[PDB]
């Protein structure tokens, strides 16, 4: 036995389909470790989760553990170069990231198949000897502030922190987690506090081995991985740090029976109901939280939400167990509010308790629990193959809370039925123990309090005893009934035999004037489920802003008529998605194949026999109206990407255009739109999964025949199947389209360097070049110069036309343009001075990314589907383009750069979108030409050509 | 939504007589009924809340009861300050509804 | 000193508009529910509407839903009822009352103003 290892649990409870082998072990210093050996993985990955979170932050230094996690990436004493950790992963087709939750600081990364040892050596040094360079502390603090400035105006984070402010002020639950520049450098130097030493005071007192968990995934054997982890992580300093618990509740009686009227940024109307409950993570064997969450958050027949639809008060409801920390949890029941549902809040909550007592009346239902036990064991047995990076991060988090032998069955399987624990939680859900919160702009001007961190104006008022006592006498409502037997639970998991004529890529098996079917039976994953994607085409889905609205409202009403029916199938892992596109409708049905056609049939039947409820039309059209105006509050970097898509697309309707034409959407016009939309269709579909070729053709005939016999569908002409083109830019042209952002104080920018049409030469020219500047653009533009948090540089493929794009969200003026051009010159000298060894280190890096095997069924279907929507159908694009990628020379890329992308390039096609804030109008930058300011989109597209479309194979 | 009926439309009793007025509900209403006295001209005065609880500052001769859907206001001994128009209420988060009214007329 | 004072009542023509005000004194209105109760001369009691001054603003009756708009201002400690599309049916004495700390309340009533709808 190795004395650096305390115990080794070799038998980890595994899914019988999981061909990966595991081994859990606990080192002598306390680090819980799980080892995953997948001899076929193309990306090795590891992750570490420290059990110290932002709750342990010093009170005077808000958000220190989060600041710590940013500073660990910037160097250790054995790897002192500031980007060595980031660059080594970039050169070997890997990525890395981390986050700071309340009780965890979780680091993770993926790396190349064969380079696990090199990266894990650099990764382990974070916990042994980090430099905390003061030149890096003075800069990366600005990247943390930009992380806050991007979230300051986000309503989800504003409510997240407003919950913190209402509790006991000196409970650590009220602590600020993110932390801006104020809490990190402006305040501590103002009071004489060495922040860098406080990082060490925190790192050398909390980052102990007994609070760490490591997961490592790679092709190396379990024994080679065991020796690989003990050599790097057994020398982590153990310090016997006590496990931080918070047994005292953050909400005492002073904070109960309280209502909070909040003003949101967006025009949203939500109602949050919170019930404080004890810590339930010790009863995970029974999990009484998901039992009550399953019934309250139920949306089926006689459910709680389905009745709130009948009265036009609510549109969505989520309810159940909400994680808090060790020692306390919450039980939420959050709902959307209609225009009338905001005015009848009390009856909503009364109807909530009218449901809760129906659960108290009929007592616990053991048949519901055992159904959950059945559904989860099946969903776990046929669990999809996870991605290595997210898998290790997730397991490293739950590795603290469960024995090694049950880390895989922890979140999934339930074992004991405990009606005593259900009664315990159900007993603590009374109005005497309630907290209400109303989010609505109808309250603006009537708020008397201001939260300090986000500026969210709200008002606190106590619930009248009249209302509480009325809620205490919650009588049993007739319209509430327990959910009936979920009959969508799949019974047949038979893996259909693989055909001898089966194909490795989707095969066009049917070509009619109506439909074109793409089919491949699953020959890789062998799971009893299938993906059914349909792309219905109709020009009247995007002719004018009126029709595109009705294309959405039709499909949005269509899911409202199916929520009762579909929720049972959703619980059986049989989900469906339906949404309007610019070309028509998009239906995607994924999940178990057993009862799949039954769901697909009712979607198509009600698609052709739909009858609008006048009550639910006006409700959704109201919500759709607020959804179009709530885009002004989106972050500027999303306004940058939005405007560029409207510029470089043949035709596109703005949010404002759809909103102005929504006043013309009357119910009679929408009723006459459906027969006109469903008049002529063309069905391009992909049926990939556990189905035969005869069934796939039979499934397609179900969609054809159902639309013919109920919508009299007529085959569409092929000359009408015109997909939109991309605007072809002029040589040496620089266009700038700028517009203001009404909410945010930062600037957004997207610099598009349009290269040429997609081709195996042009595609791998850019993907290799985008790979080379992938790391340097992130380092020079964010870590070194600290422009902002959002720094992205990659390829942009759209409508068969591609190019190189830079998306930056900063507090600096679109100076951003100068820097991006100045950064390109830094790369041009870098490639000339780039060694041949370091050059193909990038080529083999890109080849790993492209040839990365899709690990789950839904991932392969989307990869095929991408070729189908793009009308290219290059299904072997991976193997084809990598063969050409390896043939490129460094001299080939420089000729590509100097001809297409350089500042003096003869074929530079540069367009910039500048999303300005509300009051803004030593590496030296090159001389930039005076650009032509785009004034009108329609006049702009009128004077330019349109690129062709990629010819299919 | 739910409506309230009356036991009598009017009645005639003497001083010392016992008065029993009844309202009856349409649906099941668990307590949640109130009795009011309105002397002609001025505002009504609350008598019984929660269909049984005697309001503070109300003479003890008033008592409210409940039997399923029936609500009975019993005055143990009528008096010169006890003749007026008597209404009952309904309290639920539905529309509050009243009774037609009971006009207790004394007779000397 | 817990009293309620109605105001704003007078003469209106059909289709006109009135806005009544119930001035609360001796307690904050966000503490309990305010109700409006009208009485036509010769008829019993009729429930007009209610306002929950903290939130969950409006609960109206089917007989006035759409014609009446009820509101309140916590800073003024006062509740209002604007009356639109006035019929000859709505001529009545409009009472305003505080609800008790129970299921069936309305313990404190007011003077009650007169709304007459006529030429």
Q: Do A464 and C54 touch (CB under 8 A)?
A: yes
The DSSP annotation for A196-215 comes to: HHHHHHHHHHH--GGGEEEE
Q: Do B95 and C44 touch (CB under 8 A)?
A: no
Strand ranges, E, within chain C: 3-7, 11-12, 17-25, 33-39, 46-52, 58-60, 68-73, 78-84, 92-98, 113-117
Partners of chain C (3+ Cβ pairs below 8 A): A, B
* CATH classification code of A727-953: 3.30.830.10
Query: Nearest residue of C to residue B90 by CA position?
Result: C104
SS3 A227: helix
DSSP secondary structure letter of residue A923? -
Q: What ranges do the domains of chain B cover?
A: 1-108
Tell me whether B87 touches chain C (CB under 8 Å).
yes
SS3 A1: coil
What is the side-by-side strand order in the sheet with B19-25? B4-6, B19-25, B70-75, B62-67
Q: How far is CA A60 from the centre of its chain?
A: 33
As a whole number of angstroms, the distance between CA B6 and CA A945 comes to: 83
Q: Does the annotation place A252 within a ligand binding site?
A: no
Q: How many helices (H) and strands (E) does chain C have?
A: 0, 10
Closest Cβ–Cβ partner in A346, A350, A475 for B30: A475
Residue A263 with chain C: CB contacts under 8 Å: none
Q: Does the annotation place A30 within a ligand binding site?
A: no
Q: Which domain holds residue C48?
A: 1-119
Among A237, A157, A251, smallest CA distance to A205 is for A237
* Shortest Cα distance, chain C CAs vs residue B65, angstroms: 14
SS3 A527: coil
Q: Do A347 and B93 touch (CB under 8 A)?
A: yes
| Per-residue CA distances from A659 to A628, A662, A742, C89, C92 (Å) | 6, 5, 18, 41, 44
DSSP secondary structure letter of residue A278? -
Strand C68-73 relative to strand B10-13, pairing:
unpaired
A69 in active site: yes
* Shortest Cα distance, chain B CAs vs residue A309, angstroms: 18
As a whole number of angstroms, the distance between CA C57 and CA A259 comes to: 14
Domain A500-726 belongs to what topology?
Cytochrome Bc1 Complex; Chain A, domain 1 (3.30.830)
| Per-residue CA distances from A640 to A813, A815, A909, A930 (Å) | 14, 16, 18, 21
Closest Cβ–Cβ partner in A344, A465, A473 for C56: A344
What is the side-by-side strand order in the sheet with A801-810? A790-795, A801-810, A747-757, A909-916, A733-740, A932-933
Q: Do A261 and C52 touch (CB under 8 A)?
A: no
Experimental resolution (Å): 3.8
Tell me whether B30 touches chain A (CB under 8 Å).
yes
Q: Does the annotation place A856 within a ligand binding site?
A: yes
Q: Does the annotation place A70 within a ligand binding site?
A: yes
**Residue of A357, A473, A478 for testing the chain B interface, max B β-carbons within 10 Å:** A473
Q: How many helices (H) and strands (E) does chain A have?
A: 32, 27
- A609: Cα within 13 Å, side-chain hemisphere: 11
Domain A1-243 belongs to what topology?
Cytochrome Bc1 Complex; Chain A, domain 1 (3.30.830)
**Residue of B4, B41, B46 for testing the chain C interface, max C β-carbons within 10 Å:** B46
Domain B1-108 belongs to what topology?
Immunoglobulin-like (2.60.40)
Closest Cβ–Cβ partner in B46, B51, B101 for C106: B46
Tell me whether A446 touches chain C (CB under 8 Å).
yes
Q: Do A350 and B93 touch (CB under 8 A)?
A: yes
| Other Cβ atoms within 10 Å of C86 Cβ, number | 20
Q: Does the annotation place A147 within a ligand binding site?
A: yes
Closest Cβ–Cβ partner in A261, A347, A469 for C55: A261
Residue A464 with chain C: CB contacts under 8 Å: 30-33, 52, 54, 101
> Per DSSP, what are the bridge partners of residue B11?
B104
As a whole number of angstroms, the distance between CA A559 and CA B103 comes to: 56
* Active-site position among A17, A69, A461, A775: A69
Q: Do A475 and B93 touch (CB under 8 A)?
A: no
Among A180, A30, A55, A53, smallest CA distance to A106 is for A53
- Name the architecture of domain A244-473: 2-Layer Sandwich (3.30)
Q: Do C59 and B93 touch (CB under 8 A)?
A: yes
Q: How far is CA A100 from the centre of its chain?
A: 17
Report the phi/psi class of residue A289: left, alpha or beta, with left for phi > 0 and alpha for psi in -120 to 50: alpha
Q: Is A882 exposed, middle or buried (0-12, 13-18, 19+ CB in 10 A)?
A: middle
The structural domain count of chain C equals: 1
**Chain C residues with CB-CB distance to A under 8 A?**
30-33, 52, 54-59, 74, 99-103, 105
As a whole number of angstroms, the distance between CA A84 and CA A77 comes to: 12
Q: Does the annotation place A318 within a ligand binding site?
A: yes
* Shortest Cα distance, chain A CAs vs residue B93, angstroms: 6
As a whole number of angstroms, the distance between CA A512 and CA A697 comes to: 12
Q: Does the annotation place A340 within a ligand binding site?
A: no
Return residue ranges of chain A for CATH 3.30.830.10: 1-243, 244-473, 500-726, 727-953
- C53: Cα within 13 Å, side-chain hemisphere: 26
Query: What do you get for the CA distance between the two ends of chain A, in Å?
Result: 61
Q: Is A19 exposed, middle or buried (0-12, 13-18, 19+ CB in 10 A)?
A: exposed
Q: After which residues is chain A broken (C to N over 2.5 A)?
A: 814, 921
SS3 A698: helix
Among A101, A116, A112, smallest CA distance to A52 is for A101
């Amino acid at each position: 036995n190795n004395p650096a290892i305390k115990r080794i649990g070799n038998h980890i409870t595994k899914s019988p389909e999981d061909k990966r082998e595991y081994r859990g072990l606990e080192l002598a210093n306390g680090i819980k470790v799980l080892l995953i050996s997948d001899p076929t993985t193309d990306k090795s990955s590891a992750a570490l989760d420290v059990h110290i979170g932002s709750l342990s932050d010093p009170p005077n230094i808000a958000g220190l553990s989060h600041f710590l996690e940013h500073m660990l990436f910037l160097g250790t004493k054995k790897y002192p170069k500031e980007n060595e950790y980031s660059q080594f992963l970039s050169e070997h087709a890997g990525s890395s990231n981390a986050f700071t939750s309340g009780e965890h600081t979780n680091y993770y990364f993926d790396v190349s198949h064969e380079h696990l040892e090199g990266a894990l050596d650099r990764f382990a040094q974070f916990f042994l000897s980090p430099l905390f360079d003061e030149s890096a502390k003075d800069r990366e603090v600005n990247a943390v502030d930009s992380e806050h400035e991007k979230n300051v105006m986000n309503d989800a984070w504003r409510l997240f922190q407003l919950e913190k402010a209402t509790g006991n002020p000196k409970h650590p639950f009220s602590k600020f987690g993110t932390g801006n520049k104020y809490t990190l450098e402006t305040r501590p130097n103002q009071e004489g506090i060495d922040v860098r030493q406080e990082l060490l005071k925190f790192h050398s007192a909390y980052y102990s081995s007994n609070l760490m968990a490591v997961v490592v995934l790679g092709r190396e054997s379990l024994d080679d991985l065991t020796n690989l982890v003990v050599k790097l992580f057994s020398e982590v300093e153990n310090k016997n740090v006590p496990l931080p618990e918070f047994p005292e509740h953050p909400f005492q009686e002073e904070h109960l029976k309280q209502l909070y009227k909040i003003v949101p940024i967006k025009d949203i109307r939500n109602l949050y109901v919170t019930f404080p409950i004890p810590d339930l993570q010790k009863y995970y064997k029974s999990n009484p939280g998901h039992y009550l969450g399953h019934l309250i958050g139920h949306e089926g027949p006689g459910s709680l939400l389905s009745e709130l639809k009948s009265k036009g008060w609510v549109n969505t409801l989520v309810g159940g167990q909400k994680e808090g920390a060790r020692g306390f949890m919450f039980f939420i029941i959050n709902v959307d509010l209609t225009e009338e549902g905001l005015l009848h809040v009390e009856d909503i909550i009364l109807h909530m308790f009218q449901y809760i007592q129906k659960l108290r009346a009929e007592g616990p239902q053991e048949w519901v629990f055992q159904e959950l036990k059945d559904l989860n064991a099946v969903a776990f047995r046929f669990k999809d193959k996870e991605r290595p990076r997210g898998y290790t991060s997730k397991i490293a988090g739950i590795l603290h809370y469960y024995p090694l032998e049950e880390v895989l069955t922890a979140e999934y399987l339930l074992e004991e039925f405990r009606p005593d624990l259900i009664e315990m939680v159900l007993d603590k859900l009374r109005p005497e123990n309630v907290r209400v919160a109303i989010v609505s702009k109808s309250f603006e001007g009537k708020t008397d309090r201001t939260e300090e961190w986000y500026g969210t104006q709200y008002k606190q008022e106590a619930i009248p005893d009249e209302v509480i006592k009325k809620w205490q006498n919650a009588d049993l409502n007739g319209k509430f009934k327990l959910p009936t037997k979920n009959e969508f639970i799949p019974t047949n998991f038979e893996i259909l035999p693989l055909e001898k004529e089966a194909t490795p890529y989707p095969a066009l098996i049917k070509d009619t004037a109506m439909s074109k079917l793409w089919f491949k039976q699953d020959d890789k994953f062998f799971l009893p489920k299938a993906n059914l994607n349909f792309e219905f085409f109709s020009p009247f889905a995007y002719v004018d802003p009126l029709h595109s609205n009705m294309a959405y409202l039709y499909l949005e009403l269509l899911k409202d008529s199916l929520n009762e029916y579909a929720y049972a199938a959703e619980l059986a892992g049989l989900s469906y998605d339906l949404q309007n596109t610019i070309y028509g409708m998009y239906l995607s049905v994924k999940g178990y194949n057993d009862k799949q056609p039954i769901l697909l049939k009712k979607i198509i039947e009600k698609m052709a026999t739909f009858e609008i409820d006048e009550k639910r039309f006006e409700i959704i059209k109201e919500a759709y109206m607020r959804s179009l105006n709530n885009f002004r509050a989106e972050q500027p970097h999303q306004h940058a990407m939005y405007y560029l898509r409207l510029l470089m697309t043949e035709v596109a309707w703005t949010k404002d255009e759809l909103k102005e034409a929504l006043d013309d959407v009357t119910l009679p016009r929408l009723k006459a739109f459906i027969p006109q939309l469903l008049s002529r269709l063309h069905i391009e579909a992909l049926l990939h999964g556990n189905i035969t070729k005869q069934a796939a053709l039979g499934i397609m005939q179900m969609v054809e025949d159902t639309l013919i016999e109920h919508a009299h569908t007529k085959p569409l002409l092929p000359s009408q199947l015109v997909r939109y083109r991309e605007v072809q830019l002029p040589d040496r042209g620089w266009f700038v389209y700028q517009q203001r952002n009404e909410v945010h104080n930062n600037s957004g920018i997207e610099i598009y360097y349009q290269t040429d049409m997609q081709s195996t030469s042009e595609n791998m020219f850019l993907e290799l070049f985008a790979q080379i500047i992938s790391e340097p653009a992130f380092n020079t533009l964010r870590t070194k110069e600290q422009l902002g948090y959002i720094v992205f540089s990659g390829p942009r493929r759209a409508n068969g036309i591609q190019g190189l794009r830079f998306i930056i969200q900063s507090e600096k003026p679109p100076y951003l343009e100068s820097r991006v051009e100045a950064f390109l010159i830094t790369m041009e000298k870098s490639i000339e001075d780039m060694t041949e060894e370091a050059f193909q280190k990038h080529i083999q890096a890109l080849a790993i990314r492209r040839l990365d095997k899709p690990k789950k069924l839904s991932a392969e279907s989307a990869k095929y589907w991408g070729e189908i929507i793009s009308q290219q159908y290059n299904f072997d694009r991976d193997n084809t383009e990598v063969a050409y990628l390896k043939t490129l020379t460094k001299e080939d890329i420089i000729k590509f750069y100097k001809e297409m992308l350089a500042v003096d390039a003869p074929r530079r096609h540069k367009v910039s979108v500048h999303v300005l804030a509300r009051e803004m109008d030593l590496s030296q930058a090159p001389a930039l030409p005076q650009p032509e300011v785009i004034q009108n989109m329609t006049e702009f597209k009128r004077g330019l050509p349109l690129f062709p479309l990629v010819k299919p194979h | 939504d739910i409506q309230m009926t009356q036991s009598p439309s009017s009645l005639s009793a003497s001083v010392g007589d016992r008065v029993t007025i009844t309202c009856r509900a349409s649906q099941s209403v668990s307590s949640a009924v109130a009795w009011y006295q309105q002397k002609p001209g001025k505002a009504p005065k609350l008598l019984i809340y929660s269909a049984s609880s005697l309001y503070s500052g109300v003479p003890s001769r008033f008592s409210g009861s409940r039997s399923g859907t029936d609500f009975t206001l019993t005055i143990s001994s009528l008096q010169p300050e006890d003749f007026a128009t008597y209404y009952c209420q309904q309290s639920y988060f539905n529309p509050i509804t009243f009774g037609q009214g009971t006009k207790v007329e004394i007779k000397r | 000193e817990v009293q309620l004072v109605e105001s704003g009542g007078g003469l209106v023509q059909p289709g006109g508009s009135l806005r009544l005000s119930c001035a609360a004194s001796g307690f904050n209105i966000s503490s309990s529910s305010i109700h409006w109760v009208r009485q036509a001369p010769g008829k019993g009691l009729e429930w007009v509407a209610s306002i929950y001054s903290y939130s969950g603003s409006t609960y109206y009756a089917d007989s006035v839903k759409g014609r009446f708009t009820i509101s309140a201002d916590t800073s003024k400690n006062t509740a209002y009822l604007q009356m639109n599309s006035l019929r000859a049916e709505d001529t009545a004495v409009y009472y305003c009352a505080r609800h008790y700390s129970a299921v069936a309340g309305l313990d404190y009533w007011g003077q009650g103003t007169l709304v007459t709808v006529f030429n």
